[PDB]
Design a binder for this molecule. Sequence first.
Ligand SMILES: Nc1ncnc2c1ncn2[C@H]1C[C@H](O)[C@@H](COP(=O)(O)OP(=O)(O)OP(=O)(O)O)O1
Ligand SMILES: [Ca+2]
Length: 1148
Amino acid sequence: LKFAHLHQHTQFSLLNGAAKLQDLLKWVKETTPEDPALAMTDHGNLFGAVEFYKKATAMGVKPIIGYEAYVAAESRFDRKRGGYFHLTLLAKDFTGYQNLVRLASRAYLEGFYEKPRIDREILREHAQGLIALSGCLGAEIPQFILQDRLDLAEARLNEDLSIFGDRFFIEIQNHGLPEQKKVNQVLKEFARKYGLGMVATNNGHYVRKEDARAHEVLLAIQSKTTLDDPERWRFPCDEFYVKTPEEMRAMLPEAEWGDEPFDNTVEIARMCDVDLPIGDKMVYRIPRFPLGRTEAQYLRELTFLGLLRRYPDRITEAFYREVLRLLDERALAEALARVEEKAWEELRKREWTAEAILHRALYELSVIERMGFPGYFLIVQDYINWARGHGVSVGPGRGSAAGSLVAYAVGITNIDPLRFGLLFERFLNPERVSMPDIDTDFSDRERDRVIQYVRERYGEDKVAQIGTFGSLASKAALKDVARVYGIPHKKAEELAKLIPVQFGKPKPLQEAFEAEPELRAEMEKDERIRQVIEVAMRLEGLNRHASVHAAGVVIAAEPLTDLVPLMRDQEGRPVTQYDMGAVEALGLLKMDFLGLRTLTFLDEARRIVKESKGVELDYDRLPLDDPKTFELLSRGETKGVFQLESGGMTATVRGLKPRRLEDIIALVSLYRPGPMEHIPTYIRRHHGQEPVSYAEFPHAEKYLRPILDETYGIPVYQEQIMQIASQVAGYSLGEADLLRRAMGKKRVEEMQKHRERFVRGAKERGVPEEEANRLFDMLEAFANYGFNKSHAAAYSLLSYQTAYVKAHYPVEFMAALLSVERHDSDKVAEYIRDARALGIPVLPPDVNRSGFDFKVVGEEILFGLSAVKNVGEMAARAILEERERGGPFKSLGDFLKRLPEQVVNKRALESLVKAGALDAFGDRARLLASLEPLLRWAAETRERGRSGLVGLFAEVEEPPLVEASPLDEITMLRYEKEALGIYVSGHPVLRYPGLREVASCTIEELSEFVRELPGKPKVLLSGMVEEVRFTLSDETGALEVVKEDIPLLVLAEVERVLAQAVWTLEEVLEAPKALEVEVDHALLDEKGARLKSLLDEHPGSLPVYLRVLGPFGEALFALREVRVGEEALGLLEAEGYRAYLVPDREVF
DNA sequence: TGTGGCACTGGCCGTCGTTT
DNA sequence: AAACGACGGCCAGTGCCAC
Ligand SMILES: Nc1ncnc2c1ncn2[C@H]1C[C@H](O)[C@@H](COP(=O)(O)OP(=O)(O)OP(=O)(O)O)O1
Ligand SMILES: [Ca+2]
C-alpha cells in the first residue's frame, strides 16, 4: 500500500502555506522510498514551480506542477460585490505546463478581483494537457452539494466533463469534518454514475502533524491577532499534513473506499511527464534584434564607427583606409565589418597605439561572435543610445562591463578601459561559455522611460520586470510577531537592535543568541518575550510579496507566458512570478536598469549651475586632475559626495589626502572589512616613508611589482589577484577568474587541486615552490576582501564629479544635494548643517516664495515645501500651482479658502505652520490655534458661495487671528524638527545658559581649544545624541564619539574622540557651580595682581575658573590655591570683569 | 554602502453597522 | 429612525532584497 500526495500546498501559498520546500521533499522521500511523487498545487499562483522542480529533481522525487485555481462563479471580469471557488489542476505534459502558465498569468492580468481568478471559459480554452480534480470543500461541486442543490452540482459536473473529458476525477479527501461525510457520499454517487474514478488527496498545508500550531500562528500573523482573540483565522482541525499511506487509510477505510482512491493516486503521478528546462536542458532565449546585415556584422559596424568617435587622435579615416588598402566615414566601417576572420589573421603576422586598439577591438569581437553574443550587445547598445538622445542620463558603467573596449566603443560604457587598467577578460572570460551580465545606471527619474522604450521595442508580451521576493528578515520577523503579542512598539524596537548586522542584512535568531549574550536573557525576565523570540525564528525562513526587480528586467525571445508566469504590481508594472535566479536558470536574457540617485542629482546641479551663472557643466569633458576638488576631499568635506559619506570613510579620506582619481579608486576598493585595515599601510607608503618590498617572494618579484606597484604592494583588486595567478602560475586569465571564485567559495578540499596546479606552473615559470605555496597563502588571504577595477573606476568618476561640483559651486550644488534627497529628514538635516557651516543663510520654507525643492532667492537658500513632513506631494504642488494662478497668499484665511481641506488637510496645515512656511502671517502659536475656527469659516464660505450670494453677501471676511501666548524656544524648536526632520535657526540650548556655562567648549571649538594643552587630553562636551559610535551635536556641529533626541554630557579623550563617562538630564540640572570669571586676551601685567588680590580677600571653598579667550582657541585655566567664598561674584562684577556662578566641573 | 524598488503597516478620516 | 460605535481604507510611514 503506497500513496502520492497530489494536493499539497507549499511556502508559496503565501497566505496559508507553511510547508518549506526542502523538509517537505525529504518527508515525502523518507515515507515512500519507491518512485516518490509530489504535486505542488498552490493557491492561485505558480511561484514555486521552477525551484520546486529543481529541488525535487535533485532529491530523486518526481515533481508534479499543479495549481489550485480560484475559479469565478461566472466571468473573470466580474467585480461583483457570486464569488469564487477552488479547483485542483495538474499538468500531465509540457503543453499542460504551458497552459497552467497562461491560466496563472491570465488570473492575475485579466481576472484579479480579491484573489487572481480564472473562468470556466478560459479553462476550456487552456484545457489541453490538464488533469482536473473535483476539489476541496471550497470548490464548486462539493459546495453545491452542501447547499442541497444537487441539480446544479450535476449540471456543473457535466460542464467540467465537457471540458476535460476523462481527465476529470472526483477528488476525495477526509479530515474529521461532518460536511465531508455528506459531500463524499454524494461525490461517490457521481463518480459511479458517470464512471469517473476517485482520487484521494488531503490538502496539506504543513509537513508533519506537529506543525499544526506553527501553522496556526502563521495564520495569526496574516490575521494580525493574538493567539487568543477569538475570531482569529483558524483551520477546522489539525489534519492538513503530509500523511503516511497508513494515516490516509484511517480517514478512508478499506471496507468503504477500496483500493481505487489510492491506486489512482500513483497512476496519475506516473502519467504526469513534465520537463522544464533547467541545467542539462536550458536553451538560451536571446530576443531578436531587427536590422542585408548580420547580427554579428552590425555589432562590428558600430564598434568601428565608435572607435573613430572614441580615439580621435589615433583612429582616423586615413587609418582605416590603410587597413583596407592592406587588403565617407561610415562607408569604411560598413566595409570593415564584412572582413572575414580567415582574412584578419594575415595582418598581425606582418603604450596604446592605433594598431593596438584595432587588435583588442578585433579580438573581443572575435570572442563575442564565437560565443555567439553579438546580438546581446546590440540590444544593450541600442537602448542605452536611445536613452542618451532622449534626455535620460546614463552612468559610465557598472560591474565588469567597463572592462570591454567594444562596450566602451559602442557607448554601452563610458570610461576609457585602456586609459585605466580595465580588462576585457574579467568581463567575458574567453575560456568559459557563460552569458555576461550588463547592468546599467540611469537617472532615477527617467529609468522607467527606458524600460518603456524596451517594452514597446521588443514587445509588450516579451518584456517584464524578473520578479523579486522576498524572505522574512530576522529583524522584521521579531517586530511582526511582537505586534501580535500586544507589545509596545518601542521595547520591541530595542529587541530588534540586539541582532547583529554582518553584511547589509541582519543575522538569524538561531545565531543572534550565541552572538548576543543579552538575547539569551531578555527572555529570562518576561515569559511573553520567551515565545516572541522562539516564534520569530520559527517564522524566519519567510517571504513578503512579489515585486518587480528595483532593477530586474527580462527581455524574452518568445512570448513570456510561454515559459514564465506574470503579475502586475500596484503601479501597473508587469512582473515575473519567478525570481532573479529562477528566471536566469531558464536561460532568459536578464538586464539591470538601476535608478541611481547621484545621476538625478548631477542633473539638477547642471540645471541650477546653468541658470545661476551661465556655465554649461559638461561632466564627460571635465579635467580629472582639478586641484580644488582633491583639496576638498582632503579636507574631508564629503558631506554630499557619492560613495564616500560613511563616518569612517570620511575620516579615511582626510587621512589619505587623495591627489589623483586613482586614489579614490583604490580607497573605495580597499575600504571594506575587512580590507579597511590595509589603508594605514597604504597611507604610510603613499606618504614616501615606507619601502614597498617583495623580499618574501624574491623569484616572483618580477611579476608582482608591475601589478602591485600601482597600489604600493597591497593586493586590493580582484583583477590584481587574477593577474598574479595568471602570470606566476601560467594560468589563463579566464582560469584565474575561476580561481578567484573558488577562493571565495572556500570549497573544503577542492582548493588543494588549484594549489598543486599553481605550484606546477609556478616552478615551471620561476618560483622555487617554497615561495609558491606561501604566495598562494598570500592570494587566499587577500582574495577574501579583493576588487573589480572597472566597476571601481567607473563609480569613482561619479564621486569626483559630485565633489567637483561642491568644490566649485557652490550654492546651487548644495541646493541640488538638498533637492535630490528632500524626502530624507536625516540627510536634509545633514546637508543643511553642511551648508550653514560653509558660509550662507538657510531659511525655513515659505508658501509665498518657496519652490518645490531647495531654492535660491537673491542670495539665500530657501527650503522647499516638499521638505515639510506631513504635507503630501500632491499638496505641495497644489499649493504652488494655486499660488501661480491666483496671486501670492494674502493671509491665513486667504490660504484656507483658496486651498480646501480636501487638498491640504488639517494634519498637513499643522506641519506647514510648524515648519515656518506660514510665518508671513504672524505668531505661530496663534496660527495653530486659529486653524480649526478658520477651517470652519472657510468651509462655510463655500456653502454661501454654492448657494448663490455674490461677493459681499457671500463673505463676512476672515476674523482676526485667534489669540494665544507666544511659543517658547524649546517647544518652537521641537515643532520645527517634527515638521522638517532637522532644526532650522537655533537654539533650544541657548534658552537655558546654565548648561552653556558648565560645558568646556563648542563642538566647533574642540580642535582649536585642545591642540594647545597636554598630550592626548580629556574633555567634557554636551550636546544631542543621534545614533542607534553615537553622534553628538551642538548648535555648532557634530562628532563621532565611542537613544536619539536625548541630551547628554560626555567625558572623553581626544587625539577623534573616545568616550569614558556619560550622564543625563534633570540630573545635570540638579548638580552646580563655582565662580568663573571671563577674561580677554587684553589683560595687563598689573591685573593678573588686580584680579589676584580681589579673590585673595574673599576666602571660602569655591574653585575659581578662568575663560581666557586666546588668539587661536579658548583656554580653561582653573586657578590654584585661592578658593572664593561666593560673595565675590557681586563684588567682582563690580569691575570690568564678567562672571558667573557655574556648576563645579570636578564632580563629573 | 546608494539607488532603485516595494509591499506592508500604522497613523489618521468617512461609511457602514448595530444599538438604541 | 437617530445617534453612537467598529471596520474601512487612506494615505503615509517604514524597513529589507539584488544591483
Ligand atoms: N553587496 C553589494 N553592495 C553594493 N553594490 C553591490 C553589491 N553587490 C553587487 N553590487 C553592485 C555592483 C554592480 O555595480 C552591480 C552588479 O553586481 P554583480 O553582477 O554582482 O557584479 P559585477 O557585475 O561587477 O561582477 P560580475 O562580473 O561578477 O557579475 O551591483
Ligand atoms: Ca555582472
